[PDB]
């Protein structure tokens, strides 16, 4: 006997759960097929709660599914072991295609550039403009040319705090659960309590404007107009020691990123430089930009950079090869981020571009196909943006923060 109906045979053995485990591996399309094989298969899928289980597996893997679970509030039907109110299998079976529909209309919104736009006037004092920002579900924190940090309610767009202390423009910031960290034209880095807004530390070191910083896992890196990168052990907000100074660039170091392996610096001197995170020794230079580099992000093997030459470049950090040049911005590329699906760039002409990342990395793909959308709502240079599966938030010389919503569209 060369054939056995596993999904029937196991229940007949009293071993329903095993049959369920088998089906639990299937993707939606295959699971649908399995339902149609015969009544006993349908019965096992239905009573084994396989669609609830699948949706949970999508949420546990895909942050998009995670996101939607929260924003749509069908997360409240997931996990929680026992039924309780007991939404039946039929419900979760009905929901899966509605999530897929949801998802496709989101992608369509990005592609066709349908969005809800909300505009925060940061009502800056004399000096106008918003050089940096970071957000979460609850708030947007921003750094301004008037030397202030402003915190915005994410929902109401009200201003909740205004931190003052820097004697120059706030050029870069990053925050976590515990602190905000900022670099200013005044050459200081300041650590603030993310809640009380109390100054916890001030790093005196850079001789000139501090242009970028990043911290993670008890390590902080700063970089300055003084052409230096500083690497800090960051035990706590108050226990922050200078580990090494990397001097390397012939001009201002405008941006710095890193992970476990590599620190990545980019400069007005037209170079990206790679350094060992562990040894702080130089590794390799990534040259090719025809002009200064204003912005960069590093993740995995991929460095993406935006230049005064009006191009974006994609690099492999291991051989330092440029994989793709992206042309279309008519001015300097002043900020840039990416995830797995796309690149979002901002330029000095106040325009924001959205690029197919996977297409950019396919060397067969024409330039023709690479820019999905051009978003024109700023009336000044774009200094900073952050985005996720659902939105862009951008800040600008025009003294505005823009929320572009591709989920809650009208």
């Amino acid at each position: 006997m060369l054939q056995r109906d596993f999904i029937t045979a196991l229940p007949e053995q009293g071993l329903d759960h095993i049959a369920e485990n088998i089906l639990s591996y299937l993707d939606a399309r295959s699971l649908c097929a399995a339902e149609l094989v015969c009544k006993e298969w349908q019965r096992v899928i239905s009573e084994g709660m396989l669609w609830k289980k699948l949706i949970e597996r999508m949420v546990r893997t895909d942050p998009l599914w995670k996101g939607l679970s929260e924003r749509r509030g069908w997360d409240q039907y997931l996990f929680k072991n026992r039924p309780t109110d007991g939404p039946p299998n039929s419900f979760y079976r009905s929901l899966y295609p509605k999530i897929i529909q949801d998802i496709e209309t989101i992608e369509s919104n990005w592609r066709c550039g349908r969005h809800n736009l909300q505009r925060i006037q940061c009502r800056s004092e004399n000096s106008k403009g918003v050089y940096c920002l970071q957000y979460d579900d609850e708030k947007i924190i921003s750094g301004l040319r008037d030397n202030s940090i402003k915190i915005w309610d994410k929902t109401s767009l009200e201003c909740l705090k205004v931190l003052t202390g820097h004697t120059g423009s706030v050029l870069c910031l990053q925050y976590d659960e515990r602190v905000i960290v900022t670099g200013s034209s005044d050459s200081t880095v300041r650590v603030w309590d993310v809640n009380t807004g109390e100054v916890l530390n001030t790093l005196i070191h850079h001789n000139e404007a501090v242009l970028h910083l990043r911290f993670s896992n008890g390590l902080m890196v700063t970089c300055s107009k003084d052409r230096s990168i500083a690497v800090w052990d960051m035990a706590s907000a108050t226990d922050i020691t200078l580990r090494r100074v990397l001097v390397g660039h012939r001009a201002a170091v405008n941006v710095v990123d890193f992970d476990d392996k590599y620190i990545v610096s980019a400069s007005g001197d037209r170079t990206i430089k790679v350094w060992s995170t562990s040894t702080c020794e130089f590794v390799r230079t990534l040259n090719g930009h025809k002009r200064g580099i204003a912005c960069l992000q590093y993740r995995d093997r991929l460095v993406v950079s935006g230049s005064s030459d009006n191009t974006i470049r994609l690099w492999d950090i291991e051989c330092g090869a440029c994989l793709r040049v992206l042309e279309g911005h008519e001015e300097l590329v002043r900020c840039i981020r990416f995830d797995n699906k796309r690149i979002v760039s901002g330029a000095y002409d106040g325009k924001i571009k959205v690029w197919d990342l996977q297409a950019a990395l396919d060397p067969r793909a024409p330039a023709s196909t690479l820019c999905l959308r051009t978003l024109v709502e700023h009336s000044g240079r774009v200094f900073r943006l952050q985005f996720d599966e659902f939105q862009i938030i951008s800040s600008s010389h025009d003294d505005t923060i823009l929320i572009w919503d591709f989920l809650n569209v009208p």
Binding site: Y131, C132, R145, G168, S169, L171, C172, S185, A209, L211, K225, R250, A251, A252, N254, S267, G268, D269, R270, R291, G292, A294, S308, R334, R381, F383, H397
Partner: peptide
């Protein structure tokens, strides 16, 4: 204007 970046030209 733009204190956030510098070139070298």
């Amino acid at each position: 204007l733009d204190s956030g970046i510098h070139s070298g030209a």
